[PDB]
Amino acid sequence: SGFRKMAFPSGKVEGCMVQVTCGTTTLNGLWLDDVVYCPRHVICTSEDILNPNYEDLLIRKSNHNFLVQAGNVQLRVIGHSMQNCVLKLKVDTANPKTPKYKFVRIQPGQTFSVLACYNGSPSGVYQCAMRPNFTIKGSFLNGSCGSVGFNIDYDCVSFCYMHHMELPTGVHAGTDLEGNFYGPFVDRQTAQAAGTDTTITVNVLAWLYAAVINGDRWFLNRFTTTLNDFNLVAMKYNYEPLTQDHVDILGPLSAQTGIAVLDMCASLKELLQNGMNGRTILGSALLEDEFTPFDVVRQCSG
Amino acid sequence: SGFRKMAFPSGKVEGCMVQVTCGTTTLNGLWLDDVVYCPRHVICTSEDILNPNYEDLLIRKSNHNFLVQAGNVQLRVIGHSMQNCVLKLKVDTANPKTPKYKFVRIQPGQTFSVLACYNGSPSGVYQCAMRPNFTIKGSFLNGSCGSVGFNIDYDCVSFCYMHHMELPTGVHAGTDLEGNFYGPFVDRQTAQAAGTDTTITVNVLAWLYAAVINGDRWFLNRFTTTLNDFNLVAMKYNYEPLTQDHVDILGPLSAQTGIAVLDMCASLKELLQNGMNGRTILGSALLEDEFTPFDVVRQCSGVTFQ
Numbered sequence: 155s156g157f158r159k160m161a162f163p164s165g166k167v168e169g170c171m172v173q174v175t176c177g178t179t180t181l182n183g184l185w186l187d188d189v190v191y192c193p194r195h196v197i198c199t200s201e202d203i204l205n206p207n208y209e210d211l212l213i214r215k216s217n218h219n220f221l222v223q224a225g226n227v228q229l230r231v232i233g234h235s236m237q238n239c240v241l242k243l244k245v246d247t248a249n250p251k252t253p254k255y256k257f258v259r260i261q262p263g264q265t266f267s268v269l270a271c272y273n274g275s276p277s278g279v280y281q282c283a284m285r286p287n288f289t290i291k292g293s294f295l296n297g298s299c300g301s302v303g304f305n306i307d308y309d310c311v312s313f314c315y316m317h318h319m320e321l322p323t324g325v326h327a328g329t330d331l332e333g334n335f336y337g338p339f340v341d342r343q344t345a346q347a348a349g350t351d352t353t354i355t356v357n358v359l360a361w362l363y364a365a366v367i368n369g370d371r372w373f374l375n376r377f378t379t380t381l382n383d384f385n386l387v388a389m390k391y392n393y394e395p396l397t398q399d400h401v402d403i404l405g406p407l408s409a410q411t412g413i414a415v416l417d418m419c420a421s422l423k424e425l426l427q428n429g430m431n432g433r434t435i436l437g438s439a440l441l442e443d444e445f446t447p448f449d450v451v452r453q454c455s456g
Numbered sequence: 457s458g459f460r461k462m463a464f465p466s467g468k469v470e471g472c473m474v475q476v477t478c479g480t481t482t483l484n485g486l487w488l489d490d491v492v493y494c495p496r497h498v499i500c501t502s503e504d505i506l507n508p509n510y511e512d513l514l515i516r517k518s519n520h521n522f523l524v525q526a527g528n529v530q531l532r533v534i535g536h537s538m539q540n541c542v543l544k545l546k547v548d549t550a551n552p553k554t555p556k557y558k559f560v561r562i563q564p565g566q567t568f569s570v571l572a573c574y575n576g577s578p579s580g581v582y583q584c585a586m587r588p589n590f591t592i593k594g595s596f597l598n599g600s601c602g603s604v605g606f607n608i609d610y611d612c613v614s615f616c617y618m619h620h621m622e623l624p625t626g627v628h629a630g631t632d633l634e635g636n637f638y639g640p641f642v643d644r645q646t647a648q649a650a651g652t653d654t655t656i657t658v659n660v661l662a663w664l665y666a667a668v669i670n671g672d673r674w675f676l677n678r679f680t681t682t683l684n685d686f687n688l689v690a691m692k693y694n695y696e697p698l699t700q701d702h703v704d705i706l707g708p709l710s711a712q713t714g715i716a717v718l719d720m721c722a723s724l725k726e727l728l729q730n731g732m733n734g735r736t737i738l739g740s741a742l743l744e745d746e747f748t749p750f751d752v753v754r755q756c757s758g759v760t761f762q
């Protein structure tokens with residue numbers, strides 16, 4: 155029983171974190187095989203941040219401008235290339251701690267664990283969701299760049315996020331491991347603002363199914379709804395519209411609980427018009443949206 | 457900026473998790489040097505667990521009954537003994553991934569990370585607080601026994617918790633690494649209920665500081681109070697008393713933010729009576745009591761753990 159926001163064990167990723175220094179800039183790098191991945195803005199200087207010409211600054215660089223440190227062992231950069239917004243440094247030793255891994259681009263609503271790192275030393279691990287506006291509500295201090303977000307599946311580590319910047323609103327923006335940003339953001343110090351955020355409706359429904367599995371009983375109702383009537387109400391509360399794809403994803407949870415998806419949608423609808431009247435669901439008095447339908451199945455009973 | 461529930465990087469502990477099997481019972485073990493630690497209830501049958509004599513159950517068992525699985529390599533038990541509610545299995549090989557470690561016992565309100573495992577395979581990590589009633593609000597499914605709770609200081613892993621059982625109310629109970637239970641529980645199949653829990657007050661104030669550091673400042677008032685006046689109100693609302701030691705611990709947060717604790721207690725005092733009036737603090741609609749003052753300083757000052 156119980157229900158906690160749970161992160162993945164971070165050991166496989168801890169063995170890959172290194173320190174990348176270029177000039178005075180020091181951030182974290184992800185060391186897989188004989189390549190260290192890190193945000194390309196590490197080659198920028200105080201002046202080259204508002205409008206950096208990264209191709210010009212990199213063709214500009216020699217391998218011995220980069221200092222890579224795995225613990226007290228300085229790796230030797232033997233080559234450096236750029237792929238979109240990630241820098242790739244070839245090093246002369248493959249990381250013997252490299253796990254089975256792949257690079258995956260995730261979609262808004264998907265969750266992942268983030269290993270916060272400073273000077274290449276892991277500091278803590280937590281759970282995140284890719285917001286519908288392509289930001290993440292992280293916990294990051296200066297020097298956290300290069301920290302990665304991941305999932306683990308049968309000792310295979312899917313890397314799906316690398317941290318680059320903090321936006322004015324306090325949220326954070328990053329890329330996948332191929333250097334493509336999530337969202338309309340760029341690795342520049344120019345004026346940048348994220349879209350208005352919305353609640354991941356499919357995740358809340360999943361969480362509500364998790365409450366019933368754990369026996370929570372107070373929010374459901376005798377009502378059902380049409381997909382369009384629900385979406386009409388939800389959008390008026392800054393909730394993401396729900397598509398038939400989402401309804402399909404919830405299928406297994408609905409099957410396990412004997413509560414149809416559109417029945418539960420009617421329960422979310424009522425919850426949005428009444429509130430929760432002092433009560434809580436799985437210990438929360440707000441609706442949680444950082445549990446996917448996959449997560450709910452993994453952590454909950456059967 | 458930002459603020460999250462954060463656990464210690466679990467890697468040092470992951471290299472110590474093994475699967476222990478006794479008969480049909482199978483749970484997790486902690487492999488440190490040439491000893492494997494796990495709950496003693498593994499030697500129990502579905503009826504001996506109702507009322508056992510762990511003494512006699514143990515001595516009757518032999519070494520080859522304990523299947524100690526380290527991933528897939530099998531470990532050879534060359535001895536076994538008890539220490540309170542934790543069983544100890546001596547194996548022929550010392551764990552080469554053994555971290556710099558010690559066994560500590562924590563107080564209520566102190567936090568730790570938990571590495572939930574199943575069949576010796578680490579599955580997820582999360583951050584707990586020992587509740588005042590000596591339970592922890594965990595997320596465990598069957599197979600989780602032997603999952604361990606720890607803290608990391610520099611390169612030292614401090615093991616402080618081992619999971620044993622879930623209570624009928626859903627919360628969880630276990631021992632320190634020396635077998636001593638946390639709270640008034642026994643490792644037996646009987647009717648056991650959790651005592652009435654309370655709010656870790658010093659952790660709520662520490663969380664309010666984290667909110668201020670993140671610029672969430674609406675709850676700050678203008679008033680100040682006294683420990684007496686606060687604690688009189690706090691007892692009514694099932695809040696833990698705030699001691700003089702608690703105030704000194706909030707010292708650095710106080711000086712970093714310009715908000716003297718007791719001034720902060722006035723804010724928490726108001727929040728306790730008037731509620732939050734449809735507002736939120738760090739996005740949460742409840743007062744968060746699972747962040748210690750050191751937790752807050754650690755997370756807002758970037759301290760790493762190698």
Ligand SMILES: Cn1cnc(Cn2c(=O)nc(Nc3cc4cn(C)nc4cc3Cl)n(Cc3cc(F)c(F)cc3F)c2=O)n1
Pocket residue numbers: 178179180181193195196203294295296297298299318319320326340341342343457
């Ligand atoms: C508060 N916060 C939360 N996450 C972040 C991420 N982040 C960061 O870690 N560092 C940044 N600037 C640097 C300055 C340096 C000074 N020295 C000596 N070394 C430095 C290294 C960095 Cl990496 N930034 C700012 C930033 C980073 C970018 F990648 C970008 F495109 C624009 C930016 F304004 C930062 O956001 N900070």
Ligand SMILES: Cn1cnc(Cn2c(=O)nc(Nc3cc4cn(C)nc4cc3Cl)n(Cc3cc(F)c(F)cc3F)c2=O)n1
Pocket residue numbers: 155480481482483495497505596597598599600601620621622642643644645
């Ligand atoms: C859902 N949940 C989450 N945490 C818990 C605690 N807990 C547990 O995890 N396992 C238990 N019995 C086992 C049966 C097994 C059958 N096989 C094949 N392997 C098994 C392993 C275990 Cl560990 N129990 C029961 C239990 C064990 C005790 F030590 C005790 F004092 C009281 C109890 F009710 C359990 O509570 N469940």
